[PDB]
């Protein structure tokens, strides 16, 4: 089982090479904005991102050792967290703005009704900027969300969680290896490790609030959700 034999540097390279591309939206600055089309742009964008996210997940070391039923559950639980941390990382060098796509920058003034979630994403972004979060650290954090977010929700389905916990421990080792190679003292490595993992608590919080806003947007029947997003949202009944 390849994942458990990988070195820290092989783990970093495996995650970096598996990075999904940054997609464009259908935004048109000449086209008049609204409160339904803008979320329509984000919905269409998230739906195309989900297709790349799935292929990214199968290249996450250890993910394909899980059964199809467990792979579905982990993605169903973590998909909005993963989209959001990608958005936050994408927006590091754009303070006060969220870079949903290279052609779609939004500040707090647009985004209407949603503003609370917007501010939280803006705070996580400036938090990454203050910490000077590296790309090697980000791909580790994103893979941690995928394996951990749904791990605590049979017969021998305990041995499946044992494999996830060991891979999670492997990602922790890789994180410490990155910080030690950056020159951080042992105390700094532990403090930075804690700081990064505490942000994951906030990322989970933003996702829970996003799921409620998306469920409301669905029942309003205005913004049409795609077939996959409907099913992904339905997993959080």
């Amino acid at each position: 089982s390849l994942a458990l034999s990988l070195t820290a540097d092989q783990m970093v390279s495996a995650l970096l090479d598996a990075e999904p591309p940054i997609l464009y939206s259908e935004y048109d600055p000449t086209r008049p904005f609204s409160e339904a089309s803008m979320m329509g742009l984000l919905t269409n964008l998230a739906d195309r991102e989900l297709v790349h996210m799935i292929n990214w997940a199968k290249r996450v070391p250890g993910f394909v050792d899980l059964t199809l039923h467990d792979q579905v559950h982990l993605l169903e639980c973590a998909w909005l967290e993963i989209l959001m941390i990608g958005l936050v990382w994408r927006s590091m060098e754009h303070p006060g703005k969220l870079l949903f796509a290279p052609n779609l920058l939004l500040d707090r003034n647009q985004g209407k009704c949603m503003v609370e979630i917007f501010d939280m994403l803006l705070a996580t972004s400036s938090r990454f900027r203050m910490m000077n979060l590296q790309g090697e650290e980000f791909v580790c954090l994103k893979s941690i969300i995928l394996l951990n977010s749904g791990v605590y929700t049979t017969l021998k389905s305990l041995e499946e969680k044992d494999h996830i916990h060991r891979v999670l421990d492997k990602i922790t080792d890789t994180l410490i290896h990155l910080m030690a190679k950056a020159g951080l003292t042992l105390q700094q490595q532990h403090q930075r490790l804690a700081q990064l993992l505490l942000i994951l608590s906030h990322i989970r919080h933003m996702s829970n609030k996003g799921m409620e806003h998306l469920y409301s947007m669905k029942c309003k029947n205005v913004v049409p959700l795609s077939d996959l997003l409907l099913e992904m949202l339905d997993a959080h009944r």
Binding site: V51, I54, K58, L75, D227, E231, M232
Partner: peptide, 9 residues
């Protein structure tokens, strides 16, 4: 389910 078949694909 859409996610299931995309995963086994």
């Amino acid at each position: 389910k859409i996610l299931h078949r995309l995963l086994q694909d």
